[PDB]
Design an enzyme around this catalytic site. Structure first.
Site, PDB file in Angstrom:
ATOM      1  N   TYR A  26       5.551  -3.413  11.157  1.00 36.23           N
ATOM      2  CA  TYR A  26       4.963  -2.105  11.372  1.00 36.23           C
ATOM      3  C   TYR A  26       3.740  -2.154  12.270  1.00 36.23           C
ATOM      4  O   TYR A  26       3.190  -3.217  12.559  1.00 36.23           O
ATOM      5  CB  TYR A  26       4.537  -1.490  10.021  1.00 36.23           C
ATOM      6  CG  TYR A  26       3.418  -2.252   9.329  1.00 36.23           C
ATOM      7  CD1 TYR A  26       2.072  -1.952   9.587  1.00 36.23           C
ATOM      8  CD2 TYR A  26       3.702  -3.308   8.459  1.00 36.23           C
ATOM      9  CE1 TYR A  26       1.050  -2.676   9.012  1.00 36.23           C
ATOM     10  CE2 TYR A  26       2.694  -4.039   7.884  1.00 36.23           C
ATOM     11  CZ  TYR A  26       1.357  -3.718   8.158  1.00 36.23           C
ATOM     12  OH  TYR A  26       0.352  -4.431   7.532  1.00 36.23           O
ATOM     13  N   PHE A  36      -4.946   0.476  13.507  1.00 31.78           N
ATOM     14  CA  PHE A  36      -5.726  -0.202  12.469  1.00 31.78           C
ATOM     15  C   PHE A  36      -5.101  -1.535  12.012  1.00 31.78           C
ATOM     16  O   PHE A  36      -5.777  -2.376  11.433  1.00 31.78           O
ATOM     17  CB  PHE A  36      -6.028   0.724  11.282  1.00 31.78           C
ATOM     18  CG  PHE A  36      -4.810   1.319  10.627  1.00 31.78           C
ATOM     19  CD1 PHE A  36      -4.041   0.567   9.748  1.00 31.78           C
ATOM     20  CD2 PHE A  36      -4.456   2.641  10.874  1.00 31.78           C
ATOM     21  CE1 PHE A  36      -2.940   1.124   9.122  1.00 31.78           C
ATOM     22  CE2 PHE A  36      -3.362   3.215  10.259  1.00 31.78           C
ATOM     23  CZ  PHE A  36      -2.595   2.465   9.380  1.00 31.78           C
ATOM     24  N   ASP A  37      -3.822  -1.726  12.326  1.00 26.76           N
ATOM     25  CA  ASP A  37      -3.101  -2.951  11.999  1.00 26.76           C
ATOM     26  C   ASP A  37      -1.698  -2.957  12.611  1.00 26.76           C
ATOM     27  O   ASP A  37      -1.163  -1.906  12.967  1.00 26.76           O
ATOM     28  CB  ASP A  37      -2.963  -3.114  10.485  1.00 26.76           C
ATOM     29  CG  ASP A  37      -2.469  -4.492  10.103  1.00 26.76           C
ATOM     30  OD1 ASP A  37      -2.806  -5.465  10.803  1.00 26.76           O
ATOM     31  OD2 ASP A  37      -1.738  -4.617   9.107  1.00 26.76           O
ATOM     32  N   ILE A  56       0.587   1.621  -0.760  1.00 25.12           N
ATOM     33  CA  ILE A  56       0.202   3.008  -0.903  1.00 25.12           C
ATOM     34  C   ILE A  56       1.417   3.881  -1.243  1.00 25.12           C
ATOM     35  O   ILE A  56       2.572   3.470  -1.044  1.00 25.12           O
ATOM     36  CB  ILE A  56      -0.552   3.514   0.344  1.00 25.12           C
ATOM     37  CG1 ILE A  56       0.280   3.293   1.610  1.00 25.12           C
ATOM     38  CG2 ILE A  56      -1.962   2.869   0.397  1.00 25.12           C
ATOM     39  CD1 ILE A  56      -0.291   3.966   2.832  1.00 25.12           C
ATOM     40  N   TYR A  82      -5.327   6.266   1.293  1.00 21.71           N
ATOM     41  CA  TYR A  82      -6.633   5.794   0.802  1.00 21.71           C
ATOM     42  C   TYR A  82      -7.694   6.814   0.348  1.00 21.71           C
ATOM     43  O   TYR A  82      -8.828   6.447   0.056  1.00 21.71           O
ATOM     44  CB  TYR A  82      -7.219   4.814   1.822  1.00 21.71           C
ATOM     45  CG  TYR A  82      -6.331   3.609   2.017  1.00 21.71           C
ATOM     46  CD1 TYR A  82      -6.416   2.511   1.147  1.00 21.71           C
ATOM     47  CD2 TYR A  82      -5.371   3.582   3.032  1.00 21.71           C
ATOM     48  CE1 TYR A  82      -5.579   1.423   1.288  1.00 21.71           C
ATOM     49  CE2 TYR A  82      -4.507   2.496   3.181  1.00 21.71           C
ATOM     50  CZ  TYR A  82      -4.623   1.414   2.313  1.00 21.71           C
ATOM     51  OH  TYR A  82      -3.847   0.297   2.498  1.00 21.71           O
ATOM     52  N   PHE A  99       2.506   5.275  10.422  1.00 21.02           N
ATOM     53  CA  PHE A  99       3.080   3.922  10.505  1.00 21.02           C
ATOM     54  C   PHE A  99       4.435   3.922  11.206  1.00 21.02           C
ATOM     55  O   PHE A  99       5.323   4.703  10.862  1.00 21.02           O
ATOM     56  CB  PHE A  99       3.315   3.315   9.119  1.00 21.02           C
ATOM     57  CG  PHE A  99       2.071   2.941   8.389  1.00 21.02           C
ATOM     58  CD1 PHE A  99       1.399   3.876   7.611  1.00 21.02           C
ATOM     59  CD2 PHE A  99       1.618   1.626   8.400  1.00 21.02           C
ATOM     60  CE1 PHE A  99       0.296   3.495   6.849  1.00 21.02           C
ATOM     61  CE2 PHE A  99       0.523   1.252   7.643  1.00 21.02           C
ATOM     62  CZ  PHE A  99      -0.139   2.199   6.858  1.00 21.02           C
TER      63      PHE A  99
HETATM   64  C1  LIG Z   1      -6.020  -2.188   2.323  1.00 24.68           C
HETATM   65  O1  LIG Z   1      -6.193  -3.333   3.167  1.00 24.68           O
HETATM   66  C2  LIG Z   1      -5.274  -3.590   4.174  1.00 24.68           C
HETATM   67  C3  LIG Z   1      -4.424  -2.569   4.663  1.00 24.68           C
HETATM   68  C4  LIG Z   1      -3.530  -2.821   5.741  1.00 24.68           C
HETATM   69  C5  LIG Z   1      -2.709  -1.677   6.264  1.00 24.68           C
HETATM   70  F1  LIG Z   1      -3.551  -0.890   6.954  1.00 24.68           F
HETATM   71  F2  LIG Z   1      -1.759  -2.090   7.130  1.00 24.68           F
HETATM   72  C6  LIG Z   1      -2.081  -0.836   5.229  1.00 24.68           C
HETATM   73  O2  LIG Z   1      -2.606   0.232   4.954  1.00 24.68           O
HETATM   74  N1  LIG Z   1      -0.968  -1.238   4.569  1.00 24.68           N
HETATM   75  C7  LIG Z   1      -0.337  -2.589   4.739  1.00 24.68           C
HETATM   76  C8  LIG Z   1       1.216  -2.524   4.889  1.00 24.68           C
HETATM   77  C9  LIG Z   1       1.853  -1.644   3.792  1.00 24.68           C
HETATM   78  C10 LIG Z   1       1.172  -0.264   3.688  1.00 24.68           C
HETATM   79  C11 LIG Z   1      -0.354  -0.391   3.513  1.00 24.68           C
HETATM   80  C12 LIG Z   1      -0.671  -0.984   2.150  1.00 24.68           C
HETATM   81  O3  LIG Z   1      -0.108  -0.561   1.159  1.00 24.68           O
HETATM   82  O4  LIG Z   1      -1.572  -1.985   2.003  1.00 24.68           O
HETATM   83  C13 LIG Z   1      -1.765  -2.432   0.654  1.00 24.68           C
HETATM   84  C14 LIG Z   1      -1.679  -3.968   0.551  1.00 24.68           C
HETATM   85  C15 LIG Z   1      -1.337  -4.600   1.882  1.00 24.68           C
HETATM   86  C16 LIG Z   1      -2.591  -5.279   2.429  1.00 24.68           C
HETATM   87  C17 LIG Z   1      -2.166  -6.412   3.325  1.00 24.68           C
HETATM   88  C18 LIG Z   1      -1.352  -6.154   4.437  1.00 24.68           C
HETATM   89  C19 LIG Z   1      -0.955  -7.199   5.272  1.00 24.68           C
HETATM   90  C20 LIG Z   1      -1.369  -8.509   4.994  1.00 24.68           C
HETATM   91  C21 LIG Z   1      -2.185  -8.764   3.880  1.00 24.68           C
HETATM   92  C22 LIG Z   1      -2.581  -7.716   3.046  1.00 24.68           C
HETATM   93  C23 LIG Z   1      -3.123  -1.944   0.158  1.00 24.68           C
HETATM   94  C24 LIG Z   1      -3.430  -2.529  -1.232  1.00 24.68           C
HETATM   95  C25 LIG Z   1      -4.098  -1.462  -2.075  1.00 24.68           C
HETATM   96  C26 LIG Z   1      -3.046  -0.737  -2.872  1.00 24.68           C
HETATM   97  C27 LIG Z   1      -2.788   0.627  -2.632  1.00 24.68           C
HETATM   98  C28 LIG Z   1      -1.873   1.314  -3.442  1.00 24.68           C
HETATM   99  C29 LIG Z   1      -1.235   0.609  -4.472  1.00 24.68           C
HETATM  100  N2  LIG Z   1      -1.488  -0.714  -4.682  1.00 24.68           N
HETATM  101  C30 LIG Z   1      -2.363  -1.395  -3.919  1.00 24.68           C
HETATM  102  C31 LIG Z   1      -3.485  -4.100   6.327  1.00 24.68           C
HETATM  103  C32 LIG Z   1      -4.331  -5.128   5.837  1.00 24.68           C
HETATM  104  O5  LIG Z   1      -4.290  -6.385   6.397  1.00 24.68           O
HETATM  105  C33 LIG Z   1      -3.359  -6.662   7.452  1.00 24.68           C
HETATM  106  C34 LIG Z   1      -5.226  -4.869   4.757  1.00 24.68           C
HETATM  107  O6  LIG Z   1      -6.033  -5.881   4.250  1.00 24.68           O
HETATM  108  C35 LIG Z   1      -6.964  -6.528   5.151  1.00 24.68           C
END
Ligand SMILES: COc1cc(C(F)(F)C(=O)N2CCCC[C@H]2C(=O)O[C@@H](CCCc2ccccc2)CCCc2cccnc2)cc(OC)c1OC
EC number: 5.2.1.8
Length: 107
Positions: A26, A36-37, A56, A82, A99
């Site tokens: 993604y 943002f990523d 999320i 968030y 996304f």
């Molecule tokens: C919240 O922090 C991150 C969010 C993203 C994000 F912006 F891409 C993002 O928003 N997501 C990641 C991909 C799936 C959708 C979303 C997400 O759900 O991230 C979760 C976890 C993914 C974070 C991660 C992504 C990639 C590599 C390592 C960690 C957030 C955890 C909090 C949460 C929210 C709701 C329910 N349970 C837990 C990317 C990141 O690192 C690459 C993050 O950590 C540094």
């Protein structure tokens, strides 16, 4: 909530079931058009398991509507992401997220 807009079609029959691991790529972008990523930029497919509260709400419900091979744009309201808090350092307060997601396979 989350709106799912198809970019490229999936197989139309293999949708993620709770207990399966979704493997995706993604790119995440904010409203101002800033990225943002990107799992593609980090060269690391993102894997998550539905029903484990590990992503999320917009993802949990959005990616669920996708079939393997599908590419879709998920537009997620802040209440499905968030909220007011955002995630300081990556996502600002009250952010609507977009996304571009591709459902590669199920593991
Ligand atoms: C919240 O922090 C991150 C969010 C993203 C994000 F912006 F891409 C993002 O928003 N997501 C990641 C991909 C799936 C959708 C979303 C997400 O759900 O991230 C979760 C976890 C993914 C974070 C991660 C992504 C990639 C590599 C390592 C960690 C957030 C955890 C909090 C949460 C929210 C709701 C329910 N349970 C837990 C990317 C990141 O690192 C690459 C993050 O950590 C540094």
């Amino acid at each position: 909530g989350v709106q799912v807009e198809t970019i490229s079609p999936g197989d139309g029959r293999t949708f993620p079931k709770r207990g399966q691991t979704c493997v995706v790529h993604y790119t995440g972008m904010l409203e101002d058009g800033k990225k943002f990523d990107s799992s593609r930029d980090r060269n690391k497919p993102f894997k998550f398991m539905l029903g484990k509260q590990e992503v999320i709400r917009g993802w949990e419900e959005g990616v669920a509507q996708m079939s393997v091979g599908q590419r879709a744009k998920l537009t997620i309201s802040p209440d499905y992401a968030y909220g007011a808090t955002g995630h300081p350092g990556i996502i600002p307060p009250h952010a609507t997220l977009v996304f571009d997601v591709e459902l590669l396979k199920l593991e």
